[PDB]
Amino acid sequence: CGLVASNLNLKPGECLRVRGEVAPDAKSFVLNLGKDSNNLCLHFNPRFNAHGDANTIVCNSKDGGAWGTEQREAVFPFQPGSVAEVCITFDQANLTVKLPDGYEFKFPNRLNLEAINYMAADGDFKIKCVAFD
Amino acid sequence: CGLVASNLNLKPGECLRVRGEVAPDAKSFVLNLGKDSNNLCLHFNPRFNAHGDANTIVCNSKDGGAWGTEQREAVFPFQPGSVAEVCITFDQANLTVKLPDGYEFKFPNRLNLEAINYMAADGDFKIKCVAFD
Ligand SMILES: CC(=O)N[C@H]1[C@H]([C@H](O)[C@H](O)CO)O[C@@](O[C@H]2[C@@H](O)[C@@H](CO)O[C@@H](O[C@H]3[C@H](O)[C@@H](O)[C@@H](O)O[C@@H]3CO)[C@@H]2O)(C(=O)O)C[C@@H]1O
Ligand SMILES: CC(=O)N[C@H]1[C@H]([C@H](O)[C@H](O)CO)O[C@@](O[C@H]2[C@@H](O)[C@@H](CO)O[C@@H](O[C@H]3[C@H](O)[C@@H](O)[C@@H](O)O[C@@H]3CO)[C@@H]2O)(C(=O)O)C[C@@H]1O
Secondary structure, eight states, X not given: OOOEEEEEEEOTTOOEEEEEXXXXXXXXXXXXXXXXXXXXXXXXXXXXXXXTEEEEXXXXXXXXXXXXXXXXXXXXXXXXXXXXXXXXXXXXXXXXXXXXXXXXXXXXOOSOOSSXXXXXXEESEEXXXXXXX | OOOEEEEEEEOTTOOEEEEEEEOTTOSBEEEEEEEETTEEEEEEEEEEEETTEEEEEEEEEXXXXXXXXXXXXXXXXXXXXXXXXXXXXXXXXXXXXXXXTSOEEEEEOOSOOXXXXXXXXXXXXXXEEEEEO
């Protein structure tokens, strides 16, 4: 596994900033946000070459261990062998995922947790810094 | 009870940078480093006014759940209601906690672990940024 952070206490409107290095031969990496490994209000999974997919951003939720309905973005502003920053926040309706250069995605808040207390990173993505505004 | 990070995989030489907010009513705060909650190669505990200690830094280790012998430092470069920055490293001999202005606190490496996999904040210290350099 990669980095796992708990007790984040990330309230609505507060910002979680993660920056890491994407491997030159990356196939996929994951940012899991929620309450624990079984309860994720956001499964953020850029796939470079994984699960039959290529250069596709896959998001989903996991509620009580159960995956929800997958959603995919058309754009893919991630490059293997480069540094990537992802800023996440949320309200009662949506999680908002931003990237430093104009890119912004919305994903439905399906769990409606009080806060984001759990973050797990995995795959070809070496985290360099995490910041909690 | 504060931020807890695991799977850090911080090897000797690698630098852990932490920036946080010391509470205005700060009596004490803690940075725990090691393998897990029961195996800490460094218990870094600046005490403003706690457990009978005033403006004193208390370091210790925990090995298989058992606390070691406390080491105390006279120099106290911390202020309540402020921002504190520390950089942490270790080698075979010592753990080293560095502050920006030049302060350098050393604590003997008692556990001799391959890496720092675990970090936990506690007390009057709210972590705002963690970086791996
Ligand atoms: C054990 C293991 O390696 N865990 C992997 C888990 C799975 O549980 C895996 O099936 C175990 O063998 O899968 C991981 O990624 C999944 C996740 O990204 C979800 C998001 O919705 O999608 C899953 O793939 C989907 C695919 O998106 C769909 O097109 C359709 O094919 O269904 C498949 C499979 O249901 C991913 O497998 C995970 O993070 O949980 C990767 C783990 O390493
Ligand atoms: C960990 C937890 O759940 N609560 C706090 C604990 C408890 O008070 C502790 O388990 C019961 O005393 O206290 C914590 O800090 C302890 C730690 O800093 C050790 C370091 O060796 O010192 C303890 O105080 C010592 C003191 O330094 C000595 O001079 C003498 O007075 O003995 C006391 C008690 O042993 C601290 O209590 C901890 O992490 O264990 C802070 C927790 O929030």
